[PDB]
Amino acid sequence: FTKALQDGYLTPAMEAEVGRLCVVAMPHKKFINVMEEMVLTEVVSQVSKYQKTTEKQPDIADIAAYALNRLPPLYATSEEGAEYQRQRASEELEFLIQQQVKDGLGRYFDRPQIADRKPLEP
Amino acid sequence: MSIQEIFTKALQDGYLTPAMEAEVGRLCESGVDLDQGEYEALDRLMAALLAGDVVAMPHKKFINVMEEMVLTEVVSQVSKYQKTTEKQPDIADIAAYALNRLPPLYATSEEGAEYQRQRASEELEFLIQQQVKDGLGRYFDRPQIADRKPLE
Ligand SMILES: Nc1nc2c(ncn2[C@@H]2O[C@@H]3COP(=O)(O)O[C@H]4[C@@H](O)[C@H](n5cnc6c(=O)[nH]c(N)nc65)O[C@@H]4COP(=O)(O)O[C@H]3[C@H]2O)c(=O)[nH]1
Ligand SMILES: Nc1nc2c(ncn2[C@@H]2O[C@@H]3COP(=O)(O)O[C@H]4[C@@H](O)[C@H](n5cnc6c(=O)[nH]c(N)nc65)O[C@@H]4COP(=O)(O)O[C@H]3[C@H]2O)c(=O)[nH]1
Numbered sequence: 001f002t003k004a005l006q007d008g009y010l011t012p013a014m015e016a017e018v019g020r021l022c023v024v025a026m027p028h029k030k031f032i033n034v035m036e037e038m039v040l041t042e043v044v045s046q047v048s049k050y051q052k053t054t055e056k057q058p059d060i061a062d063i064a065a066y067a068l069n070r071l072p073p074l075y076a077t078s079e080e081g082a083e084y085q086r087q088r089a090s091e092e093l094e095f096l097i098q099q100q101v102k103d104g105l106g107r108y109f110d111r112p113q114i115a116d117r118k119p120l121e122p
Numbered sequence: 123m124s125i126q127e128i129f130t131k132a133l134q135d136g137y138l139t140p141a142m143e144a145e146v147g148r149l150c151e152s153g154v155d156l157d158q159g160e161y162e163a164l165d166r167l168m169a170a171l172l173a174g175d176v177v178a179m180p181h182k183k184f185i186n187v188m189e190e191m192v193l194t195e196v197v198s199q200v201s202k203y204q205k206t207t208e209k210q211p212d213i214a215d216i217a218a219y220a221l222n223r224l225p226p227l228y229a230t231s232e233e234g235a236e237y238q239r240q241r242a243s244e245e246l247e248f249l250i251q252q253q254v255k256d257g258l259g260r261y262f263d264r265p266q267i268a269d270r271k272p273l274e
Binding site: 009051064076080117118 | 141182213218235269
């Protein structure tokens with residue numbers, strides 16, 4: 001508590017530590033990657049077919065993250081900025097987004113789980 | 123985009139898309155409801171979400187590790203300016219500028235998040251510093267862009 005009082009900002013290594021017990025604070029709410037929204041929409045649109053089968057729906061996080069690492073980041077902090085990032089993705093990146101979601105889906109099916117892997121909360 | 127319709131489709135298709143998550147988000151804003159069929163629909167969606175019959179978008183389950191690196195570098199760079207200036211710098215503005223000019227480092231595991239910090243440490247350290255500096259620079263140049271509503 002004393003350190004952030006002097007260094008003047010609540011820093012990510014000493015911000016997620018108030019997630020271990022569970023002066024400016026880090027703004028995570030105020031910015032987002034608009035590509036995340038576009039990719040999830042395309043992931044749901046592609047994995048829909050499998051929802052009428054018996055078991056094993058494909059993991060969306062795995063597919064979205066693969067794809068997000070192979071697309072341009074679209075980080076905005078305003079509603080206007082977000083609309084610009086949506087218009088760009090919808091008008092310029094539509095085929096890029098499909099291929100990567102499809103690559104991701106095919107990667108998931110090839111290895112649905114990966115050994116020695118603990119998933120991640122905040 | 124009636125909440126009855128949302129409940130309908132969500133249950134049928136077995137997801138809640140980002141468009142649907144947004145309409146349910148905005149719809150929770152202290153306004154009028156049917157208070158009965160709008161209210162009931164939201165409560166059924168709830169029960170279905172909790173059962174696992176509507177899967178919502180796993181937002182909490184993947185993260186761009188690069189946001190941690192960037193946020194830590196911005197604090198490092200803005201820290202020396204704290205006393206100099208009423209209105210501290212906009213951290214969000216600076217990090218978003220930089221994040222748009224850096225590789226994404228998304229992960230789903232703890233081990234993945236570790237490989238991505240490793241990559242950032244050993245290869246991207248200077249690149250990150252330079253993008254945060256350019257972001258910080260653009261902030262001091264133009265601390266307030268006109269005609270923006272912030273997100274929350
Ligand atoms: N066609 C068009 N697109 C526009 C316009 N203004 C913004 N955009 C687009 O929207 C993205 C997000 O803008 P933002 O939400 O203001 O989000 C901005 C903002 O928070 C910050 N930033 C950038 N420049 C400045 C600046 O001069 N001052 C401050 N304070 N923040 C800035 O960095 C974020 C990312 O900026 P970018 O990577 O440039 O990415 C921008 C850019 O692609 C515009 O007038 N026309
Ligand atoms: N040097 C090194 N780096 C490693 C290793 N394993 C993972 N990484 C790195 O860690 C990142 C995050 O991996 P993740 O959290 O497993 O998160 C993964 C996971 O959610 C998913 N994914 C990728 N490949 C597969 C796969 O074959 N099956 C499944 N189910 N998901 C996958 O996509 C996410 C992003 O994958 P990438 O873009 O490749 O991003 C990977 C990659 O950059 C390793 O053995 N060595």
